[PDB]
């Protein structure tokens, strides 16, 4: 539950928080102690209220996950580093080949411009807000890179 309620910049801020928070708002109601059940569980319990947004924010379910995942592999590490992994370039490079169908150095350069122009390449996913990812999500779409 604390991951769901986690706010940007907090220790428990994670991919689950980022994904759920943009499709709904979660709020704490009460705390339930382990004594309140028998046989007593080894973990504490809680009650939360989930309010799903109507209308659903019009962003692709896959694209939002795709960007969130690659940057949350190391949340406390810089976003630029998260894209330095070799497989991140390979999975992303083919995704660009898909865009052209309907170049490793180029996708390297394109990523460099996006992180530099958005001024997001030097911050950490654990300290980022919905808007920051959305701006990151755009800047890749403009340069033709789609995550998922």
């Amino acid at each position: 539950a604390l991951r769901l309620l986690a706010r940007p910049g907090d220790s428990l801020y994670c991919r689950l928080s980022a994904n759920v928070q943009m499709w709904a708002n979660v709020t704490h109601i009460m705390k339930v102690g382990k004594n309140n059940f028998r046989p007593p569980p080894q973990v504490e319990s809680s009650v939360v209220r989930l309010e799903i947004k109507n209308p659903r924010p019009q962003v692709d379910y896959n694209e939002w996950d795709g960007l969130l995942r690659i940057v949350f592999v190391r949340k406390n590490r810089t976003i630029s580093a998260g894209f330095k992994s070799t497989t991140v370039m390979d999975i992303l490079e083919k995704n660009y080949k898909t865009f052209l169908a309907m170049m490793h150095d180029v996708v390297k350069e394109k990523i460099d411009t996006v992180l530099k122009e958005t001024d997001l390449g030097d911050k950490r996913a654990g300290k980022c807000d919905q808007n920051d990812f959305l701006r990151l999500l755009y800047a890749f779409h403009q340069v033709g890179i789609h995550f998922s």
Partner: peptide
Amino acid sequence: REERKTIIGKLQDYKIDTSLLTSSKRLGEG
């Protein structure tokens, strides 16, 4: 929020299917 509204509104201009796009789930395959 109003900044968010522009971005999400602008996102409509750049939207594409995901069918052939390989998800980032493949990231760990290496």
